[PDB]
Amino acid sequence: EEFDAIKIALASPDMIRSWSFGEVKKPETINYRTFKPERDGLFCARIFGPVKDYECLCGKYKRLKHRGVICEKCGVEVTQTKVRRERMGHIELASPTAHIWFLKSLPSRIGLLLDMPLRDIERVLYFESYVVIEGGMTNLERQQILTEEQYLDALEEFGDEFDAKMGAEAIQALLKSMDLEQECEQLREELNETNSETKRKKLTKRIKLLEAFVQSGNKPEWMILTVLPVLPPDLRPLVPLDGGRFATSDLNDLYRRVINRNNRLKRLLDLAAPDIIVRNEKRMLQEAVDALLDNGRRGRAITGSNKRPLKSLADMIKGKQGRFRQNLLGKRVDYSGRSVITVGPYLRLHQCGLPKKMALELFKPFIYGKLELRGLATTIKAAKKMVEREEAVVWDILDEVIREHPVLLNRAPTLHRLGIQAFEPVLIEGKAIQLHPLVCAAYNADFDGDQMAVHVPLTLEAQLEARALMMSTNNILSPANGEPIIVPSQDVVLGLYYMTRDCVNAKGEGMVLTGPKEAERLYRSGLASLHARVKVRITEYEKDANGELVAKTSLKDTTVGRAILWMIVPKGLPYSIVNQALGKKAISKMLNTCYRILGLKPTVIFADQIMYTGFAYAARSGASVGIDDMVIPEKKHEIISEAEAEVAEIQEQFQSGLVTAGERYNKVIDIWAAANDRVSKAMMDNLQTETVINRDGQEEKQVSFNSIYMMADSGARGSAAQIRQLAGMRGLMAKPDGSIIETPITANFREGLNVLQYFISTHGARKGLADTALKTANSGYLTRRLVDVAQDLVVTEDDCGTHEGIMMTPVIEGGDVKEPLRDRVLGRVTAEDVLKPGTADILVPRNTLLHEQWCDLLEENSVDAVKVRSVVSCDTDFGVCAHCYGRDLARGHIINKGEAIGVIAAQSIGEPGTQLTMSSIQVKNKGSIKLSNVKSVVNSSGKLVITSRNTELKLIDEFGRTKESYKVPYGAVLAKGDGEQVAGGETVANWDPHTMPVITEVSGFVRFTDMIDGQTITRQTDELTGLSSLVVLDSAERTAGGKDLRPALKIVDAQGNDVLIPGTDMPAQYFLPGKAIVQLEDGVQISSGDTLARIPQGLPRVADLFEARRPKEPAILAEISGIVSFGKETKGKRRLVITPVDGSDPYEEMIPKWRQLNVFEGERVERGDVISDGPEAPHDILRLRGVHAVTRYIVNEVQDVYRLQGVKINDKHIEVIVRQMLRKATIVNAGSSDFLEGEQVEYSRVKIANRELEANGKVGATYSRDLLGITKASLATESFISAASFQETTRVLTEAAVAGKRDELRGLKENVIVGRLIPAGTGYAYHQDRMRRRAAG
């Protein structure tokens, strides 16, 4: 068994000879009649083997009497058959041919070896003419074509000392000639003398490459083919059909082609034919080879009479139709079934239907073995005939066998784990599968013609997994997020919401009950109202003492429904639980609380009884809909007459040649909107409490029985928008442009539609539908590419003994808290001693599991940031420590080693991603104000205005939480200064839409400077008012004469000097950008707060965030600190001369100057500071900042995008998938290894755990971190197997084999593809057995 690793190197022709069992010489396959093998063709039975076993063709020698005998009658060996799968032939060629993937693949592995270019050798081998096979005199070069009339000069010059003729043999001899060693050691010897610049690094490239081939062990001669194996017959079969028609694999075609051309070449070379035909035959042989190797890549594909091209070998490994994706990873199943589904309303949780027909079909082996055991069917003829005749015992024994015999259930698409579960059978003669209605949601399944599929645990590990793991009763929480999956579907909730209700109108007000018994006696007798708050007695309990119930009774004036319900409650809770009208939120929290304190089993029976009861009385509750449940409001004609008069006025306005259309058109839409929103009011007023039903009085009105508001209130179906679109206007409607129609839906469904309103709705319907049907692929790719990365994490030390790691702060932004820090802290270890807002009140000694005693202790405290020894910050090499991960969620305790995940992440993230694609600063409420890192100014008017783009407003509450978050234009006009307090509901900024003002706080003379007609600007009169100045065009419109120089109308005094900014020694003029149009002329004076210039006016991003593609257009954050200055002057984009304090200046990046900047031409930035208004590449963050800041940036952005959509995932996933991004360690120094070699950060830690230690102080090198993406990490892997599975298998196979790779089969897909166990799951015990063995010698 045991393995470490093994070596590989190229295919010897000796090896194909040894492997093969006989030359194939012919293309011939069979006879025309006697459909039987051909000697020395492709199906040579004497080579590959016979059909029967230990027998010769005559049948002399047989059955291991004559074991290693060859029947000399037919010369046929007495040998066995499973080798028929093995035994290959071979083929000896006329002339050498080469392997295309050593040739056409990127860096060639043969051209990169020689470093002599390609097209040279192409024409050497398209034989433009004679060609230097060997420039014996280096005067002549190899790979040098010599024409029939130029060759003679090489000839009569040297004659002897050159070989300049045709063929692949040129390259053969080349590879055989070149010697790698002494180049290597020489390049080293002169590396030591002067380890030069680019010169030496390419010396070094070669030196290490050379030695890599040396010590790796390689033989680039076998880059070139001389022997060609023959794939066995049954690897490329040829079979008949019923109608005599035959059927084949396309490979035989190419096999025949190659053999025929080769034999014809054997002919032409015996005749010394004119070698032009030998060239053509050589091109043809190499072509047929290369098409066996890769046909449709070279040129126009080869096709039959079909005109369709024919599949090669490579596609049988590659993409879909290869082994991997189609039928090695994903199979067709034995003993399965599937059919249409319907509801089981009277199921228990563990149950499922089984039409006994398919019960029998799948379980015939058990019932047969059992009919033999009893012996009624004495033989299998008897059992099969008895079971065709359907004995009565077949039924009782089918029940016997099926009793306690779990089975799986599968619906397409299997998004996450819970789409497939395992229930107990319930045998039925109903052709429809019955299904416990509550797991309609995990399946996303609703009964509109759906079919489920079914699978059979035969073995006992599978049976017991089905019952312990897939079971309906071990799965009660999403691991995406710890919510219950037991939601009331839509009916028991409607039921309960009806029961525990509290009217005023029906009857039976204020009498007394000793308890819910006479509540049921009354309500089942027909006396009380279920919905009537009537005095009763309760006797709840509580476990106040140490798990010790505490009895008590009391009275509570409560409804008949809550009363009657309360008995279901399992005597541990208070009555306030049931003392409201049971919203489904309450029901979530009910089974929550139930599970929490009780453990679980009550919550089980409890929920069963509640499903039971709500279904029962909801059928007794009655629910329907009527025409008058939607309205004919009394004010229907009057609204029409009013709208009639309004549009008549609009008509006459149009008649005038005034309001012309846009004002008119928008006016018309707005008035229609308001008119039928008033209709909506009329109607919802004319239903809900219109039932005036007196009772013992004058009159009283009460909620009428519409059923629409009720089914809208529980959460079953509907909501205010549904009810308006039935009632009021159906908002506006956008035609396919994305613009918005300005004459709406006026009517509704009851009143009656118009043809074109309908037709406009068809557009939005169709657009949204095509979005739905065409993004299952998008998640498809994102999920599956992420999973193919999937490796694991295993712990090794109790605590790494290491220090702090990550900070925890909650995720409240935009709205309320979205992850309590109470939860974020939950189960983790503290980085450190942590205090309370009563400070120096330590509560951990640097590390404690902070279970909810602590998280609640600290929810009690308003402490607002804590740190955690992170799994990242765990410094245990080749693993982590347990405290740093914190808690196992399933165990609910600090985690134990070995179990690990990450497709869990994939399901959690992808499964919801299916549909979930479809100026001002304010504070809202009281409290302190904590806004900073902004440049702003008290503008001319006396309130705050931004002058650094960074700020985004937040509406902070009195405790401190952000209630709202919104963005703010630079240079805006506020009515609030931050650090004030305001009543919410206020336009804090009344901004001008077009003007972006250019106010001059200074009072100095203006005069036209820096700015001249038709270079930096135009000067172009403001036509409407009529006065002007120098008029600053945008970026592209001005000519490039002065586009290289910033236009700045300048302020001066009577002296001409720089009117410095008031309070500082800084000059004050404005490098005017586009639209900055000054209206008053040269020499004019401006005032304080005076405008020189007036400036008028998805899931794809998910793909972008995950694929690590660069951000795109605009300028970015300060790359490096130190003074930064401007560069090359606008060849489209101007550059940025950075000048770091001690670092290096030369970096300069094209920036849109059209997109205005932040740091001026001689202002300093700190690194990682915004330069402009736009994003930055995350690679800038990893290369510039460390790891925590970058990963924080990414996870921030991505969960903002999701959280936007009403989304929730335990973000542990989004960080572990980023640990799996890339671990490429770009070395900083050299001395131990190369200077910037991509190495295992692991092995990096190893070397520094060896060399930097007293072996040296330091001889080696330090290292950096890297990114560049997930897919290339998939590629960039120890194994090539997991890499050579997915798309572009070809190039991966090339680069795999070229090293002679010999993967050690540890990763997931690695051991998978050979079907042997991998470290965990079922194989966990054996893997850790091997681990203890490795520890135990």
Partner: protein
């Protein structure tokens, strides 16, 4: 351009067509060189040992007019062979040879009289023009004997030069100047080379490889200088035609590519038909007689034509049709159409069969066999859902219930036969080959237990009644319905 058709047509596009005497000039250079290799035959060592012995060998089998003699003389008139004229024309040839030879001995090899008589032996010859195979073997008896001397020239050169040394410039003027004696050795070594004086430890095999060479002479009976002369005289006599034909072939390349691309419908393929026509043209270049005075393109069109018209028969199909069946099928797919003309509506095979001249069953059979196979990789599903390979079922290996039935059966037969007398069970088991690899006979219950044979019949019968016995026949009875 990746296409070899552009490359090839541009490459044949290089050479032009040379017509109306260069064709006949190719033929004349060819026949001239040929005539001179048969001259080289006329001046023979043992290699030939034929010229007239061959004619006595073709007549020695009491009468023949068969394949060989149409490989022999077949003279052109510048036909059934009456042997009268055969025995006529050979007399003067023998007279010429015998009268030439004694003068070839007079005063020298090729004395002026002798040389004019060799010239007469040549002028008498050039009105003959004859051809294949045995004459090919006649000259092969000179080709292999060329390789006798080169063989020894390689052996002794290897065994001498590669351990010793020597110069080259002296060697040619020394070796060709005498060629017969070793005076050139002591003349080369007349001076010095004490490295030559090192000649020991190999001596016994050097002049034993020279033994192998010198014996070639007496085999030949012929002097090494004349060996050199007539061998070169034959080799150039080959090379003449060898390069002369290529002119014709390069001319009529376009003849070929035309004639072939007349039948490059979707029958097989362009370049293969073009190749086959090129074969037919070379047949024409080789066979053409300018003395008929006809165009070559007609002749080459015949050869090109037949070449392609039957290569497309031998080639072009996975199921190898012979020619005769194809000729029948030609008759039918010709005659059927005359039939539906005359008929004017469908000829189901009795309104077809008669005019074909063959009965119904042939027309019907061919109507069945015209199904070329139907290529698994086709999408029988209009969508890319079911290539035919998916539908195919495999009824060859076994079905597991059958394995179980057989196992239960023979287990029950073991359980039934287990309880007999040893002789009954053993003769039965072995006699029916039960549980081994033999086919045992009652001749062998004879030859093995006891030469008694018929009591084995009456033992088998007793065992069958012992074992049919329907307290036992019922584990057998479920197998009545097999």
């Amino acid at each position: 351009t990746t296409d070899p058709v552009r490359m090839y047509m541009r490459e044949m596009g290089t050479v032009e067509l040379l017509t109306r005497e260069g064709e006949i000039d190719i033929a004349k250079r060819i026949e001239d060189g040929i005539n001179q290799v048969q001259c080289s035959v006329a001046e023979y060592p043992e290699a030939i040992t034929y010229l007239l012995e061959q004619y006595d060998r073709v007549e020695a089998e009491e009468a023949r007019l068969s394949d060989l003699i149409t490989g022999f003389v077949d003279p052109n008139a510048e036909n059934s062979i009456d042997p009268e004229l055969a025995r006529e024309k050979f007399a003067e040839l023998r007279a010429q040879y015998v009268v030439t030879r004694d003068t070839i001995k007079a005063k020298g090899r090729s004395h002026a009289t002798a040389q004019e008589e060799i010239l007469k032996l040549s002028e008498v010859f050039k009105q003959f023009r004859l051809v294949p195979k045995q004459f090919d073997y006649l000259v092969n008896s000179m080709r292999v004997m060329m390789d006798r001397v080169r063989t020894q020239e390689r052996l002794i050169m290897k065994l001498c030069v590669e351990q010793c040394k020597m110069p080259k410039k002296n060697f040619i003027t020394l070796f060709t100047g005498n060629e017969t004696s070793d005076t050139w050795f002591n003349a080369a070594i007349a001076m010095n080379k004490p490295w030559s004086e090192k000649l020991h430890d190999v001596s016994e095999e050097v002049h034993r490889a020279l033994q192998k060479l010198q014996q070639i002479e007496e085999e030949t009976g012929l002097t090494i200088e004349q060996v050199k002369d007539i061998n070169r005289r034959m080799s150039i006599g080959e090379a003449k035609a060898r390069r002369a034909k290529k002119e014709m072939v390069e001319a009529n390349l376009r003849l070929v590519i035309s004639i072939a691309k007349k039948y490059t419908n979707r029958g097989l393929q362009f370049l293969d038909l073009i190749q086959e026509g090129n074969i037919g043209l070379m047949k024409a270049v080789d066979k053409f007689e300018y003395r008929r005075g006809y165009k070559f393109s007609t002749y080459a069109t015949w050869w090109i034509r037949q070449a392609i018209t039957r290569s497309i028969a031998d080639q072009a199909r996975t199921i190898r049709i012979p020619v005769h069946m194809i000729e029948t099928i030609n008759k039918l797919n010709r005659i059927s159409r005359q039939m539906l003309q005359e008929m004017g509506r469908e000829p189901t095979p009795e309104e077809l069969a008669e005019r074909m001249l063959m009965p119904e069953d042939k027309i019907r059979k061919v109507l069945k066999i015209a199904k070329e196979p139907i290529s698994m990789e086709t999408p029988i599903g209009d969508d890319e859902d079911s290539h035919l390979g998916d539908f195919i079922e495999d009824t060859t290996l076994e079905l597991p219930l059958d394995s179980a039935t057989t196992e239960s059966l023979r287990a029950a037969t073991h359980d039934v036969l287990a309880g007999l007398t040893a002789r009954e069970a053993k003769v039965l088991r072995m006699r029916f080959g039960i549980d081994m690899n033999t086919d045992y006979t009652l001749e062998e219950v004879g030859k093995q237990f006891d030469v008694t044979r018929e009591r084995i019949r009456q033992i088998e019968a007793k065992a069958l009644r012992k074992l049919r016995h329907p307290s036992r026949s019922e584990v057998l009875r479920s197998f009545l319905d097999d």
